[PDB]
C-alpha cells in the first residue's frame, strides 16, 4: 500500500502495536559474540543491546578492538550509517578514536546528557574553547572552535586532533536538544529541520566516511532520523516514489543492528515525518522555510 494512506487505516484501526509486532517477529537475528565476550562487560551500556559481529566497527588496535557501534550500508539508497551508544566513562576515548579511523565529518547526538534524573551518556565534548579535552588511552585531542545555540538543536564546530601524527580535522556536532523525556514529538517538523541541516554541512555526503549517529543505546531516536532520511531519499531516486514501504527498510536496517524503532510511537513517528517531508521536498521546496518557521529554532 501507499504510506499516507496506510498511515490513515492503521490510526483509524488502532493496530500500531500488532504491525510493530509483527516488524520485531521477522527480524535478522544474527550472532554478537565478541560483545558479549567479558572482557568487553564495561563497553556496553545496556547488556541486551549489542552489535552483531557481521556489522560492527572495529578499532585499528591490537589489544582490544572492540565498541558498541554498527556499520548500516544502504545499497540502493547509496547512503552508510554509524549507529552507536552514548558514550560510557571509559569509552569516550574509544568513540573519538572511531570517529578518527573512519574518516567521519559529523557526529549526530539525539538525548540529553541527563534526562528523566539520570544519566544517559558521558560529556564526551568540551563546553569552553579554553578547556580542551585530552584522551590518553587513544592519544587524542578535541577543542571546541564555535557552537551555535538554536530553538531546538545546537550546533557545534570542534577540532580533533591525532596527537601521534599532529594531523588535525574539523568534525560538526549536530545536537537535537528538545525530544521529550517520554514518548515522541507532537509535530516532525522540528526534527525535519534538523535533518536536513545535517543534509546541507555534507556529513551525510559520499565524499566523507559515513556520519556517527547515537542517542542513549543507540536504536531508539538514532533509528528514527536514519530510516526517515533513507526513505526521503529513495522517494528522490525513484521513478515511482509510492512504492517506498517503510517497514521494508526498517526491515533491511535491522540486517545490520538490532532493535531499530523501539516503540510502536517511534514507528508512528518514523511514518509521519516521511509523510510530511516527502511534501516539503517538492518539488515543493517552500516547505522547508515552512518547517524551520513551525520549528521556532530561534532564541
Ligand atoms: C581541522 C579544522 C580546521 C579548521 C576548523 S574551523 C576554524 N578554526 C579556527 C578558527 C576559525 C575557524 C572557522 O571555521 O571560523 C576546524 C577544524
Ligand atoms: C535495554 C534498552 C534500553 C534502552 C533502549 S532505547 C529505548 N528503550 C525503550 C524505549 C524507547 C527507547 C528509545 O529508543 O528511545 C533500548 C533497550
Redesign the pocket.
Known amino acids: 500500500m501507499e504510506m499516507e494512506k496506510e498511515f490513515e487505516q492503521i490510526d483509524k484501526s488502532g493496530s500500531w502495536a500488532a504491525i510493530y509486532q509483527d516488524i520485531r517477529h521477522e527480524a535478522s537475528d544474527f550472532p554478537s559474540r565478541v560483545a558479549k565476550l567479558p572482557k568487553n562487560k564495561n563497553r556496553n551500556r545496556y547488556r541486551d543491546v549489542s552489535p552483531f559481529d557481521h556489522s560492527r566497527i572495529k578499532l585499528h588496535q591490537e589489544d582490544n578492538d572492540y565498541i558498541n557501534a554498527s556499520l548500516i550500508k544502504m545499497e540502493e539508497a547509496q547512503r552508510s550509517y554509524i549507529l552507536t551508544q552514548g558514550p560510557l566513562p571509559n569509552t569516550v576515548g574509544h568513540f573519538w578514536e572511531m570517529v578518527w579511523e573512519q574518516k567521519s565529518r559529523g557526529v549526530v547526538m539525539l538525548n540529553r546528557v541527563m534526562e528523566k534524573g539520570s544519566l544517559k551518556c558521558a560529556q564526551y565534548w568540551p563546553q569552553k574553547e579554553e578547556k580542551e579535552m585530552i584522551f590518553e588511552d587513544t592519544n587524542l585531542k578535541l577543542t571546541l572552535?564555535?557552537e551555535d545555540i538554536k530553538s531546538y538543536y545546537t550546533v557545534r564546530?570542534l577540532?580533533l586532533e591525532n596527537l601521534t601524527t599532529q594531523e588535525?580535522?574539523?568534525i560538526l556536532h549536530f545536537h537535537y536538544t528538545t525530544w521529550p523525556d517520554f514518548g515522541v514529538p507532537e509535530s516532525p517538523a522540528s526534527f525535519l529541520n534538523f535533518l536536513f541541516k545535517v543534509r546541507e554541512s555534507g556529513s551525510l555526503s559520499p565524499e566523507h566516511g559515513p556520519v556517527v549517529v547515537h542517542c542513549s543505546a543507540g536504536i531508539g531516536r538514532s533509528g528514527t532520523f536514519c530510516l526517515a532520511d533513507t526513505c526521503l531519499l529513495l522517494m528522490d531516486k525513484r521513478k515511482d516514489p509510492s512504492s517506498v514501504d517503510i517497514k521494508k527498510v526498517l526491515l533491511e536496517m535491522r540486517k545490520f543492528r538490532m532493535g531499530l524503532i523501539q516503540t510502536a510511537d517511534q514507528l508512528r513517528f518514523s511514518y509521519l515525518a516521511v509523510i510530511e517531508g516527502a511534501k516539503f521536498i517538492m518539488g515543493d521546496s517552500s516547505v522547508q522555510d515552512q518547517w524551520k518557521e513551525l520549528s521556532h529554532e530561534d532564541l
Open positions: 572552535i564555535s564546530q577540532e588535525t580535522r574539523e
